[PDB]
Amino acid sequence: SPGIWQLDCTHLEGKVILVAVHVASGYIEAEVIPAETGQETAYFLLKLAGRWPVKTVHTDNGSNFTSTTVKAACWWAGIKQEDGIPYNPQSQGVIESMNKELKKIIGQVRDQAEHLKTAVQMAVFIHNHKRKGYSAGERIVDIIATDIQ
């Protein structure tokens, strides 16, 4: 579970926000892209796995599951590519909630930047620092450190 991430795609202002959630902590990375392609998703995964020890990715849809570019990135970075079927029905609800919370933070910061990408990065910052008392940022670091030991 320290190595499991879930991909998530949401829309705002005619653009796409691509999100990876570290499942055990709720810590997130996110980027704005014009549209979700195999290439964009493969590139995002490569960035993510250079930064965190990514063992498993649950892809956000069947297109990214199927995508040969996505599979090439997962091969490259040593990631086990998995489906994102919520065999646990609570998974749908956790992600739906996260999308709504992210969008609310984006709306709270939206006037502090011209570009959506800036607002989304501000939202990422606030989400990962929010104490719920540990933050998601602290949780992921603790989970991975325990693992290394």
Place this chain on the structure above:
Amino acid sequence: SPGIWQLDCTHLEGKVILVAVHVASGYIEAEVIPAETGQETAYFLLKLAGRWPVKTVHTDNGSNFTSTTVKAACWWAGIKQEDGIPYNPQSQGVIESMNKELKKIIGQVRDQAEHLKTAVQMAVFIHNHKRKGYSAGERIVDIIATDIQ
């Protein structure tokens, strides 16, 4: 010590690679940009600080030290903006070496992507996973987790 990062700018193929180094571990983040501007540097810092607990940034040059956009990003993300003066002369030598090693990895992966940005992310991945037997990736996590406890 857990919160100290150093900005570093290097060139390749007529483009700019902006690097942040976590000093205590040697762990890096990097991006390709067409030129180093205040806005690009500010945006990169905002991404960095949503991801890692960034307390201090030693900026890479006086322009970025001076830049009001960079100061705005550091204010935003709660970062102390500092100069990068190598009062310890071993600092220039560490960065120069890091730049040469990154450029060497990029040349080794260069044919595996059309775009420089992809090669640079492959280089980031390889750098952070390289065991020296702990990796930079393992050191940053252990250092930050030790600090949290």
